[PDB]
Design a binder for this molecule. Structure first.
Ligand SMILES: c1ccc(Nc2c[nH]c3ncccc23)cc1
Length: 273
């Protein structure tokens, strides 16, 4: 019965993603996020199997919701005359990885390893579901502070996964691969692995490695913090200039630096509590 299934709390944030509100599902008191996007402001449109015109974001979110919990799940959506309203899961207490790094600086490698591992599992889930995120960065990762579990958010720059070339990109430039910069061409998986190398450097160094196009294209990685040789190796592998020189997800997860990861709860007990 209408939107009246939800009680609206404080605004959490607004930007290119729309305006996102804290809220509660009235029926079972479940914490939710309520995201409003103006129709006039949506660029990418898709279609539901049912045969309904929706934002591509809804299509992607629908394809990745299910048992696995590495992605923030879409629970419901509504169409208003001038906007779409999306009902998403809300961990509590929560902090996004960007704010976590801002507050705590470079992460100890054991913590970075646990977080990176969970991000890998989430991205693998997306790809298994036929979805490319295209905007993997610390701002799009939430930490369930109590369970030590990470969750991917914001599929508004996403696309269906395909094996052919992409020639369009609307994600974050400083996380985008040299092939995008030089040629306006990339393939989904190798571009994702590039963004994961930027994210891993970000975790262990406290900031992203590249600010300018020239630095991305040069691809030379300098460490500003003490970082193990194994971790540096993995980062530099993910950041190979030639897309085909980058590791697959299997290769990343089998890397020496990724061995003996902590469980989420263990991570929380050691690093978050
Ligand atoms: C696009 C889609 C969703 C979000 N935020 C959130 C979903 N769930 C949340 N829970 C806490 C804080 C923020 C969010 C941001 C951009």
């Amino acid at each position: 019965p209408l939107e009246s299934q939800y009680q609206v709390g404080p605004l959490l944030g607004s930007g290119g993603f729309g305006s996102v509100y804290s809220g509660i599902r009235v029926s079972d008191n479940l914490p939710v996020a309520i995201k409003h996007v103006e129709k006039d402001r949506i660029s990418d449109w898709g279609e539901l199997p049912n045969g309904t015109r929706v934002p591509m974001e809804v299509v992607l979110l629908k394809k990745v919701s299910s048992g696995f919990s590495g992605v923030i799940r879409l629970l419901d959506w509504f169409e208003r005359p001038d906007s779409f309203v999306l009902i998403l899961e809300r961990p509590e207490p929560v902090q996004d990885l960007f704010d976590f790094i801002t507050e705590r600086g470079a992460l100890q490698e054991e913590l970075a390893r646990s977080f990176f591992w969970q991000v890998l599992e989430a991205v693998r889930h997306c790809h298994n579901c036929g979805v490319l995120h295209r905007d993997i960065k610390d701002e799009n990762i939430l930490i369930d502070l109590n369970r030590g579990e990470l969750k991917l958010i914001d599929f508004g720059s996403g696309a269906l996964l395909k094996d052919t070339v992409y020639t369009d990109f609307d994600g974050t430039r400083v996380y985008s691969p040299p092939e995008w910069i030089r040629y306006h061409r990339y393939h989904g998986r190798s571009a994702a692995v590039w963004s994961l190398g930027i994210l891993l450097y970000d975790m262990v160094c406290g900031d992203i490695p590249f600010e300018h196009d020239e630095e991305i294209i040069r691809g030379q990685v300098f460490f500003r913090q003490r970082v193990s040789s194994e971790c540096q190796h993995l980062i530099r592998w993910c950041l190979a200039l030639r897309p085909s020189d980058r590791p697959t997800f299997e290769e990343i997860q089998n890397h020496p630096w990724m061995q003996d990861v902590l469980l989420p709860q263990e991570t929380a007990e050691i690093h978050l509590h």
